[PDB]
DNA sequence: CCTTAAGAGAGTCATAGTTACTCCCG
DNA sequence: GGCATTTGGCTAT
RNA sequence: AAGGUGGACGGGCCACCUUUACUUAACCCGGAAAAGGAACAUAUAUAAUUUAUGUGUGUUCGAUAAAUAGCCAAA
DNA sequence: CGGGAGTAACTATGACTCTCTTAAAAATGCC
C-alpha cells in the first residue's frame, strides 16, 4: 500500500514529491491522478499504522513474562493467564491438554463507448423492470441426462414394505371433513395464495379464475363435485417440471444431484389441495417435536433449545451427545403406500383416504429446459410433488411414527422429570443422548425406520459431537465416532462449525462467530462498483441489502459493539455516495421518508427490539416441554436488558412468562420504543442543521420528491438534500465553529452572514431568478384558474384614495365572486413562518375592497395569501383556495405536489446560479 | 421579489464490571 | 378522458 | 515548448497536428453516462473446410421458479 | 473433590480530542 506519514496536516504526494493543500487534497490527488485506492497512514511518534486517516490524527495527541505460549510465542506473567489464553485463542490445543490431563468512418474507440453505454442501459432497464433481479446480479454473482436420470428416478415404485411396530400420534378427528366447501372459504384461501405465481400446462392463472368467476360460484360447484365424488378429473392430472439450482457455484452445476425438480400443477387443483390440506391438518394432530410447516416460529424455538441445552450441559457438568441428520431427497423418496398406511393407522375417514390416494393415482409430467425444449412424459409413481400444497403435511404424517418411536423408546437427555430425544424441523432431525452408548440405541432406531420405509440419510450432512465432563470444564470427542449405515460420521472438532437452520454451531462456544462484517464490506463494495446513480445505490442498500443481515443478527444474539461498527460502515458508505459532508447529522439518513429522511435502517435501534420480541415470542410458545428446558431467569434478565437497551421504559417492562372462513390471527408482542421518531426528535433539537425541520414532520406532499425522483437530475437532488440538512458549502458552513480563521461575509455584497437563506431570499445578485420564480408560480396557478373557466385579471394597477399604487398578482372572477391572491416564497425557519407570510400578504391589500368591486363588477370579495416554502413546504391552508376554485380531490393533491417540487428545485437553481457566478468570476 | 446567524460526527482511550474458566490447598 | 387507488423485503425446509 | 482540435460531457492524462491542419492507440475520477457491444435468426455476395468468409437487417440479453411456514417494515 | 483466588478477552459508559473544495411517478380500474 501507498504509505503516508501524518504528523503534518499538509504532506506531499509520494508519487511526485509535490505538496498539496491538505490531506483531503492528497487523497483527492491519489485517487484521481493515480488511481491509488490503497492508502495507509502512519503515526510519526510510534510507527502505528492504520488504513484510516482520522484514526491516526486521533492517535497523535494521546500517543505515549515468565510463561510462554508454545503456539504463538506470547508471554504472560502467570500460568492461569496462559491457560486462559490457550482456552480463548487456541481451541483444540486446550482440548488436547484437557484430554491428556484426564456514422463516422472507423469503429475502434466507439466499441469501448458502446460497452459503457450498454452496461448503463442494462442497469437502468433492470432498475425499472425488475429491481429484485438487479439486487441479485449486484450482490450474488449468479437433455438426455435429465430425461434418463429423472425418468429412472420417478417411474419405479418405492421399496416400502410395512410400518411394523411404529405407531402414529393418536387417532384422527373425522368431524373436520363434514361441512361443505363454501365460497367464502375459497375466497379466504385465494387471499392466502401467492399473488403472482406461474400457471400450469392448462395456462390459467389465479387472477383469470377470479375474472372468469368473481363470486366463486362455479368453482364451488366444481370443488364440491370433486369432494363428494372423492375423485379428481383426468383433465388436471398433467404437470410441468422446472429445475432450480441448489447452489450458485459453477463447480457444482454440472452434477445432476444439485438440481431440484419443482413440479407445477393446475391452478384449480393447487387451490383445491390447499382447501383439503387445511381440513386434514385440523384432523391430524402431530407430535410436538415436529416444528416444521406448522403454525409456529419453529426456527427460533429450535435454535434457542439447542443453544440452552449445549450451555446447560457445560454449566451443570453433565454428558451430552448431539447428532445431526437429514433425509436424502425427502419428498421424492417417500412411497405412496407409506402415506396411505400412515393415514390408515390414524383411522382417517376412508372417503378422504380414497380421495388422497386418487390424487396421486395417475400423475404424469414433462421437464422443460434450454428455455423452451421439453422431454417426453414421465409417470410419477414414487414421491410427492415439490410445489403441491399438500406435500409438507403428507411428509409430516409419514415422518411422525419415527418421532413417536424416538419419544417412546429412545434414550434421551433429561432435565428434571422431562426428557428430549428428538428435535425436528421438516426432514432435519437432531438426536440427543445422556451417554455415548445411548446414541447407538437412537441410531439403531433410525436405521430400523430407514430400512422399513426405504428412506436414506445424506452422508454429506451427518455430523455430531460428544461432551464429556471433567473436574474443571469438559472435553469434546474423547471417544470413537458413531456409525450410521456403516460409514462413520464427521465429528465436529473445536474451532470448526457446521450449519444448522442457517446459523453455525461450534461445540466450543455455542452459536459461532457471525462474519457479518466481511459480508457487509463485500456488499457495499459491489453496490459501489455498479453503474448506478447515487440514490439508486442508496435504494439497493436500503430495501434489499440490509434485510439480509436481520435473521443472523437476531438469532446469534449480537451485542451492541458489532452493531454500531456495521452502522458506522453503512453511514460512511451512504455519506460518501451522496457527497454529503462527514459532519452531516445521522437523522437525515435514519428518519422515515414521510419525515423528510431517506429511510435507511439503524441496526443498533432495530436489532435489540427484534431480539426482545423473539424472547417474548419463545416464552409464550404452546410447546410445554420446550419451556421446561428453558433457563427462565437468564431469559427474563436478558429480556430486561434488551428492553432497556432498545429505548424502552424502565418502569413498564412486560412479563414474558365458521372456523373455515375466519381470517388467520397472530399475536403482536409489545415493541419497546419507536426509534425512528426518536431520530426525528433529536433532529429537531439541533441548532443549525435542525433549523425549521419541524415543518416537514408528517407532510406526505412536501416529501413526495424523495420517493418519486425519476425525472429529476441528480445534481439537483443532491443539492436539495444538502439544502434540507443545511450542509451546503457556503462560507458560513465552511466557518461554523472554526471562527478564528475564516471569513463569514458574502462573496457578492457587504452582508455579514452568507447563509443559504441569504442566497435564496435576499441577496441582490439573485433578484432576477426570484422574480422569474414568482412569475412562473403565478402562471401555474393562473392556468388552473383558466381550466375551471374563471376570468383572470392578472396584475392590476389599483390606486387607492390616497393615490398610492398597489399590485396584487391575481384576481379570479366567477359568478360575482372575486378572489384576490398574492403569492410569496418564504424560506422557512419556524413552525409559524408561512402562516405569518400569508397574514402579511393579506394585510397589504385589505383596505382595497371597494376598488376591486368596481374593477371586476363583483359582489363578494375575499383576500387570500398563498405562501410556499423555499425548501418545498406546502402550506396546509392553500387547499381552501384550491377547493374554492373547484378542483377535484385528487387533482388538489397532485397540484400541491407540483407546487412544492417547483418551489424547491427553483431554489436549487438559485443556489447553483450563485455558485456559478462566484466561481467563474475568479479569473477576471 | 425579498428582509437575513448559532458543529456535529468520527475516533481513541481509560475504568471497571461479566463470562468462562484454571490451578492449587484442606 | 376525469377521478380514485395502491404501490415491499428477508429467512428456514 | 506555444495555438489548437480528437479521446460522448466536466476535470485529469494521452495520442495527433502546426495558425488550422493530421486524422488517432490506450486510460483514471465523477453529481455525466439508454447498445457503432454480445448471442442468435435470416437475406445477399466471393476464393467451397459453406457448419466458411465479408456485409446488411431484425429478435433477444427480464419476469415468466412452484409450495408450506415464519419474521421485519409501512400501514 | 470442594472451595477460594486469580486472570484473558470481551462488554458497557464517560470523557475527551480530532476533521473540514468534484460543472452547465405510473399502472390499473371505475364513471
Ligand atoms: C429447499 C426447499 C425444500 N423443499 C422441500 C422439498 C424437500 O424434499 C424438503 C427437504 O429439502 P432439502 O433437505 O433441503 O432438499 P432434499 O433433501 O430433497 O435434497 P438433498 O438430498 O440434496 O439434501 O423440503 C421445498 O419444497 N422447497 C424448497 O425450496
Ligand atoms: Mg434433505
Ligand atoms: Zn501524485
Ligand atoms: Zn502514535
Ligand atoms: Zn498463544
Ligand atoms: Zn449577498
mmCIF file of N, CA and C and ligand atoms in Angstrom, chain A residues 746 749 758 763, ligand 6:
data_model
loop_
_atom_site.group_PDB
_atom_site.id
_atom_site.type_symbol
_atom_site.label_atom_id
_atom_site.label_comp_id
_atom_site.label_asym_id
_atom_site.label_seq_id
_atom_site.Cartn_x
_atom_site.Cartn_y
_atom_site.Cartn_z
ATOM 1 N N UNK A 746 -20.472 37.596 2.731
ATOM 2 C CA UNK A 746 -20.943 37.215 1.404
ATOM 3 C C UNK A 746 -19.934 37.609 0.332
ATOM 4 N N UNK A 749 -21.774 40.798 -1.877
ATOM 5 C CA UNK A 749 -22.263 42.029 -1.267
ATOM 6 C C UNK A 749 -21.724 42.109 0.154
ATOM 7 N N UNK A 758 -29.785 33.805 2.965
ATOM 8 C CA UNK A 758 -29.319 34.989 2.247
ATOM 9 C C UNK A 758 -29.300 34.769 0.741
ATOM 10 N N UNK A 763 -30.326 38.256 -1.333
ATOM 11 C CA UNK A 763 -29.118 38.792 -1.962
ATOM 12 C C UNK A 763 -29.434 39.437 -3.313
HETATM 13 ZN ZN1 LIG F 6 -25.012 38.659 -0.678
#
